[model samples]
Every structure is written in C-alpha cells, then in structure tokens.
Target: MIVQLGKASVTWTRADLEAKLAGHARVLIDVGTGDGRFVYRSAGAHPDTYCIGVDPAGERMREVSWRASRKPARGGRPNALFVVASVQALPEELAGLAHTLTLNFPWASLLSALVLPEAPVLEALRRLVRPGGELIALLNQSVFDDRPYAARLGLPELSDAWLDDALRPAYRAAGFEIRTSEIVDGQTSWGQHLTLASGRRTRLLTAEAIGGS
Candidate 1:
C-alpha cells in the first residue's frame, strides 16, 4: 500500500521489504538508510563487519553509488552496499544476521499510529537482530529544528521526559533491553537540534541470564 508520508511518498509491500533483507549473514543492516552515508561511515569504524544500507528509493541507491565512487579511500575498508528496499520487507537472509540494525529517522506513521506495534515491520526488525544483537531507533526531539517539518507531517512531538517514557516500555515490550534511551541535543547546520530518542536491544544472553533475577 502506498502511503503519502510528509515529504517523501512511500509505497511498501510487506513481501517486498522482506525480500531485500533476506540472504545476509552476520552483518549490520541500516533500515531507512538515506543515501547510505551512515553505513559508509560505520563501515570505516568496524572493518570486520559488513554494512548494508536499505532504502526503497532507487534514486538514493544511485546517489550512494556515486558517493562511494567519489569517496576517498580510508584505511582500505570496504564501502557499504546499498539496496533498494524498505523496513517493512526485510529479507530472509537478513534474519539473525544483524549485530546491530539501525533505524535512523524511520517513518513511524508510515507503519501505523501505535508506536512499535506488533506489526510486520516490528517483527522484521526483531528478526534482523541476532539473539543478542542491538537495534537503535532515532527520532527528532519536539523542540528541535525539525519541529516545523514534523508538525506539517503530523508526527508526534516529543519532550525528553515523554520520549523516555514512551520509548522504554515500547522497546521492552518488543523484547529489547531499552538501554540508554535519551535525547542528544546539539548544534548543527540547522541550528540547535535534538535527537528525540535512541535505544539499544537487549543481548540474548543478558536477557536469559537476567530472567527472574
């Protein structure tokens, strides 16, 4: 189903998104990866890990390829692979392969009103992470520079306190550890802005070990 999301129009089928995520082993996948910049940057920091940037927009993939060709070689690390895919249709190969699945600026409303609801997208995210792997979800804070943009899109504005409360329980319910959920406020080209939320998934071993403790 195609949904008109703020600036970008997105039409994603569950099967399509799932197919893209499939067929990967022991790698990190970046959902909603725009232009593949983050994955590229991350690959430099962790050479041993393979980074996959998934976005539904084919144009973005092309842009990523162009950027990669122009990027100066740094320490001979491999460039990230960009795939034309969506978060809702994570492929089978990606299941259990991701050590860290990052959902940077994912379109929440595109999925549903219920935050982190029990939906295909959420399940896909859970499946992407290895038993003890992590998932990092980020959103813009209420008082950030993106307020105007967010308001226009009907996105929920979030304060620091609201962010923590809203995200922690949702992540925990989704079988995550909810580690270090907080807003990162800083100055950027857009002026002072804030990252509304960030949280890590629970390690499987830790979840098991802490069972009933």
Candidate 2:
C-alpha cells in the first residue's frame, strides 16, 4: 500500500494512483527525497509531469505533502505526491511507473546500497522505471570522505574511478548502463548547503535502464 497525504494518512491502491496519474506526460520519482523539495518544485514547474518523492522518513516529508494536498488555487500542485517507503522495499504499486528516477544525496541505507551496489536495492531500481527510463543520482563526496562517520558507518569512497569500476559494473549487471558522470553544481537545498556552505563536492551520474522494468 502507498501512504498518501490526507487529514488522516490515506492508503492508495494501484487504481487510485493510476487515476491520479492520468493526463500527466511523464512520471518522475525521487528516491531518498528529504522534505520533498525537489518533487514539489518539479511538479509546480512542469505541470505535465507527475512528481513523486519516496522516503522512509514520513515526518520529514509531511509538511510538503500536506501543502501538495491542497487545492490548486491555494498553491497545490495535484501532480505532486509523496510516498512513505524505502528504496530497498519500494511499494509494488510503483513498479514500472517512472519515466525518470532520481536519487539526491542519499544517506544511511540508501547511501550504502548505492555505494555497495547491493542486489536488492539495485534490483528495485531496475524495476522502478520502465525500459529506457532515466536514472539520475547526485552524490556528495563529503559523506564518503567524512572521517569519523565514514569510519564508523563503513561508507565507501565515492569517486569517479569508483563509479566507473565498482558502480558501473554492478549497475550493468542489474540492467542499467551509465550514460554520463561529471561534477555538477548542487540541485537541492541539502546539496547546496553541502556545496555552498560546507564546501563539499557533488557528482552527478545519469544512467538508463537497459532491459524491461
């Protein structure tokens, strides 16, 4: 079941979600989204695209989800949605639903999964988007480089070489091909704070799902 925003949290079935998604040109999903900022902005900026943010921390996204639940005249974007889920255990209702999938500055389990390119997580990603769908990731160097946290949490080094050698091979095995990877300016508040305020570097990786979702 998908948890949708409402006076009481609403459980949405596949049909309910399909009805909401009708008429949108594309479906954009943000995994590990923090506070739903990217999804909210994207949905408002591109009304033709339906934007969904998925994060396990439901409370973090509650405010934005509430705002998006409002009527259009009151600043709501009906195309925006927030789902309470972790990438490792994505709701089956969302399988093969995305035209584009984004992972922005992932932390904790999500970070470890991508860095390690674990089977379950990689498999979920392969199923989340349709064949040829895009996968975008913004990774911060600090998270992997932070000495104490990295040591304590066992975070792997995140570098271009690592992506090419470690991440790419694993992703390819899971039916995704890396298209391009480069250093990019921050695209979200957390990323901007890490880059602008903290002087961290972020790398952008764009890939495509090769086989059927």
Candidate 3:
C-alpha cells in the first residue's frame, strides 16, 4: 500500500510498516491531522515513538510529508509517517495499531456525527485501538461553520457537557471507559481559533479501550 509523506508517497507494504514498528514500543495515531504539525512535533520530540498522521484530504499533507522525508540533516524526523484515510475507511494495517489516538479539531459531518454517537464513527474508533489503548479527542465549537448533519437526533450540537454526560453511554457500549471528559483549552489552530474567535472552549474527551465491543 502507498502511504503519502508529502509531495511524494512510498509503497509501504505490511512488512514495511511492521519493520517500522519494530523499533518502537508504542504507536501514536492522529486522525484529522490537518497539516501534520502535531504529528511532526510529537515524532520529533519522541524519537523512540512511532507517530502517524491520517486524513481524508491528501493535498494538504504533501509539503509536510515531503519535509519529513528529507535527509536527517535537513530536519526530517524518521519516526513520522502520514496516511490518507478517513474514520469510516481506515486502512486494515492500522485496525489495532494505536496505543494512543487523537482527533484534533474535527469539523463537518465528523464533528456532527459525534453527538448522535453513530455506529460507523464509534466502531471505527473502537477498531483503531488495542485492548488498553486510549483515545483523546479535541473538539471545538463549530456553530458557525457548517451544520451538515440531521438535526432530529436532539443532541445536534457537540459540547463538553454532552461529552461528559450523554456521550459516556455510547462509549461504554463500545467497550471503552471514559477516563476524562471536560472543557479544556484549545491546543491547536482550530482549537485556538475557537477560543479567540468564538469565545468558547473546546472539550478534551479521553477514554481507554476495555476489552472489545
């Protein structure tokens, strides 16, 4: 399978990835990784870690992926990788690969789907983690951007209150135990913007995979 790094992509078969994983003890996956800033930073900061960035959009990932593949003297981080995928259609190679998963600043259908606790989204989240693996989602207020989901679900909006209260039942049903779900300062671009522009805080929803669904 081909994995996009930047302007270029490399054919990474299962063996290739396994080989890469051979050097690391744990895997950190970032879904909805926009330009891969966080992935790159984390990979650079923790040389012993295996870091991956995934997104459905590919064009925006090229430059960062390219830079990450450059010669080490040019500041490339060897442990970093980028993949083109969405929550609903994750690569089979990553089904149970994550030790820790994160979704920073989700929007559109994905942001909306969280409120309804939709199966596809929840199932995908469940599949990405190993038993004892964890997920940390950083969500911002998206009231003005695009509201593209069906509003009949009643929990049409995503909020810290909803995550702490209503969201736990669905997560528990999916085999994860909610560890922490609370209002937190936005850490990334979309998150920071939500604070500055929208006068609101984001929610950090963290949970651990128990056994299986």
Candidate 4:
C-alpha cells in the first residue's frame, strides 16, 4: 500500500498507475528523494509528466507531501505522487515502470554503490529502468567523503586521489553505458554549500541501461 503523506489523495492501485501513464507521455522516478522537493518541482513544472518520489523516511516527508497535495493554484502538482520506500525494497507493483530514473545526491547505501560500485544496487536500478532508458545521478562532495561510506566501503581517505577515469570499466561491465558523466551545477542544498560557497565539486553522471547479467 502506498502512503499519501497529505490530504488523502486517491487510492493508487495498478489501474491508477496505468491511468497516469495513459494520461501522460512520460514518467520519471526519483529515488532517495528527500522532502520530495525535486519531484514536486518537476511535476509542478511539467504537467504532462508523471513523477513519483520515494524515500523510506515517511515521517520526514509528511511536510512536503502535504504541501504537494494542495491544488494547482496553491502550488501543488496533481501529477506528482510520493511513496514511502527504499530503493532496495521497492514494491513489485512498480516494476518495469520508469522511462527515466533520477537520484539527487543519494545518502547511505544508495550513494556508496554509485561511488564504489555494487551489483545489487545496479540490479535494483536495472529492474526499474527500461532498456535504453536513462539514469541520471548527482554525486556530491558528501559521498566522496562521507565518513560512514569511507569506513564501510574501505574507500580511500581522499576521494579525488582515488577517483579517476579507471572506474569506467566497472560501470561498463554492469551493462550501463555511460552517456554523459561530468560536473554540473551544484543545484541542491548540500551541493550549494559544497560547490558555490565552499569551492568543492559536484558531478552529474548520466547513463543508460543496456544488455545484461
């Protein structure tokens, strides 16, 4: 069951999911979405696109989800929806659903696998994205130096020292063909602080799901 954080939206079953798709030409999935800001903004701007933002912390999301329930005049997007879930535990009902997948500076295990590379994460992502579909991620200074990630993954103490073009082989082997991987605007909260104010760097990595396991 999908929990709607705010004003009790419609009961969303497979038919509703199907109806949204049938109504819109495109669909976007935002994983590790904190506060649902990114998804809210995306759906609010592009009404023709249906967006779903997911995060496991339902309590933290109540504010944004409530805000999103407001009418269009009150700054809400009827096209957007939020769900309480972790990428690792996404529901089967959502399988094979996205045309585009986005992760805005993932935290915890989500960020680790992208920086250091992990199969399960990619496999989960693979299941969600259609073949040839795009996956765009934001990697910030945090993931490179997150203390827990460093300790847990045995990552080098210094991210820049360890990060290089050599990691491409791992992504290639995972059936994700790199389309574009480069530093872009540090547009989010951590990104703004780390890049614009602090002079640290943030990168945007875009790839496509390809052949298989």
TM-score for each model: 0.59, 0.84, 0.83, 0.79
Q: Which candidate has the top score in TM-score?
A: 2
Model 3: CA > 4 A from native: 143-165, 185-199
Ranking by lDDT: 2, 3, 4, 1
lDDT of each residue in 1-213, candidate 4, tens digit only: 375666443346777677667788778899888788989889978888888888877766777788877877887777888888787788666777778899987764676677677777777886777777888987664543434534665433214433445345666776677677666652467556565433466577788888644
Give me the displacement of residue 66 in model 4, in angstroms: 1.8
Best by lDDT: 2
Worst 10 residues of 2 by lDDT: 143-152
- Scored against the true structure, residue 107 in model 2 reaches a CA lDDT of 64
lDDT digits (tens) for residues 1-213 of candidate 1: 332222344565556544543553447778777777788778677666677777777576565545544536522334455666666575565566677777665554432322434444555577767767776666532222322344444434344564467644555555556554444542343422322223321111111001122
Superposition error at 29 for model 4 (Å): 0.7
Pairs with steric clashes in candidate 2: none
RMSD of candidates 1 onward, in order = 8.9, 4.2, 4.0, 4.5
Predicted structure 4: lDDT: 0.72
| TM-score, predicted candidate 3 vs. hidden true structure | 0.83
Number of backbone-clashing residue pairs for each candidate, in the order shown: 13, 0, 3, 0
| lDDT, candidates in the order shown | 0.53, 0.80, 0.77, 0.72
The residue-by-residue lDDT of candidate 2 on 1-213, one tens digit each, is 566574346688999999989999899999988789899999989999999999887888888888898998887989999988887579999989889999987764566677776867888887889888999987764543323444456556667788878988998998889887766652467666565533476667788999743
Q: Which stretches of candidate 2 lie over 4 Å from their true place?
A: 143-161, 185-199
lDDT of 3 by residue, 95-187 (tens): 788999997777655665565667668778788898899888776665434454564344444456766666778888787787886666524
